[PDB]
Amino acid sequence: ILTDENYVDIAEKAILKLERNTRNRKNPDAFFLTTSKLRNLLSLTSTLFDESKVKEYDALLDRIAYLRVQFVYQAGREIAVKDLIEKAQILEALKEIKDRETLQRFCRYMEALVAYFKFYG
Template identity: 55%
Template sequence: MINNQSRNNNRYQKPAFKKPQLNISFTEESYVSEAEKVILSLKENNFKHGRDVLTTSQIRNLLSLTSSILNDLVFKEFEQVMDKLSYLRIQFVYQSGRNGAVKDLVETAQILKILENVQAKKDKETLIRFCHYMEALVAYFKYYGGKD
């Protein structure tokens, strides 16, 4: 009797969110195709997480912070943008906390891990690659039907 009740209750549970697991190597040769894989995996869930939806505005806001760092790198050394890089990490964490779909993007694309690696390496080229990775994520999001 207990088994029948638990089976009946399980029928009415919401379907589990399919959380993609991707191996992101973030090399110069791979980051563009990895960005595409991230977006395609998020598209499987229609860019949604529960009621939260990933929008172009949300992802472009994060890109604009990234772009300002890229612009600063033209005139400044890496050490001079470290504080902005830390602020960028905080913004990714904050936006992830506000919206589950943004969190799915950040986790699937391994953005926080990559940013930690950029800060640890203190390498200008790696930071530039991260900025281009963000641009690729936005471009593929729009290409594969991301909504405003």
């Protein structure tokens, strides 16, 4: 769960709580998770963060159902994204949308994950 006053500090903690490549000491403490696998997840939510402005919530609930498809599917492919949806409680937060203002809160929550990931290494 994530409120408006904490969802960035939640996402700041989740990147720190995510593991790093403790071996392979060539620019070490780098993540197993990569930037391009992370931007494939935000490419789902960023096209809903701007159709939340335009459209109703009553038309977006077909793709909001589809975000549980592909956040599961991207987690099944690579084990690094598998850890992201566990640490950042994404599959818990995605089942809790129910209106426009949480859809925009979750889609800003994914942007906070990308921001601190780019920040911390």
